[PDB]
C-alpha cells in the first residue's frame, strides 16, 4: 500500500468532496482515498492510511 499523503487537501478554497481524518485532523480527497459519498454517510470517524500506519490498532469506524 503506497503512502497516501498526496491525497491531503491543504487548499483553502477546494470544492472537491473531502473527509476529515479524526486521527490527524487533515482533510483528504474522497476520490483519492477511495471513499464514495454514499459510504461516507456511514462513517463515524475516518482514520487515514498514515494514521493507521502510526497506530495499527486504528480502523475507520462506521455507523
Amino acid at each position: 500500500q503506497e503512502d497516501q499523503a498526496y491525497c491531503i487537501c491543504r487548499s483553502s478554497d477546494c470544492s472537491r468532496f473531502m473527509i476529515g481524518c479524526d486521527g490527524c485532523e487533515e482533510w483528504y480527497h474522497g476520490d483519492c482515498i477511495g471513499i464514495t459519498e454514499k459510504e461516507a454517510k456511514h462513517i463515524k470517524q475516518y482514520y487515514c492510511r498514515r494514521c493507521k500506519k502510526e497506530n495499527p490498532e486504528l480502523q475507520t469506524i462506521f455507523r
Binding site: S15, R16, F17, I19, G20, D22, W27, E37, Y46
Partner: peptide, 9 residues
Amino acid sequence: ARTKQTARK
C-alpha cells in the same frame, strides 16, 4: 464523519 463539498446528488 466531518465532510465537505459533497455532490449530494
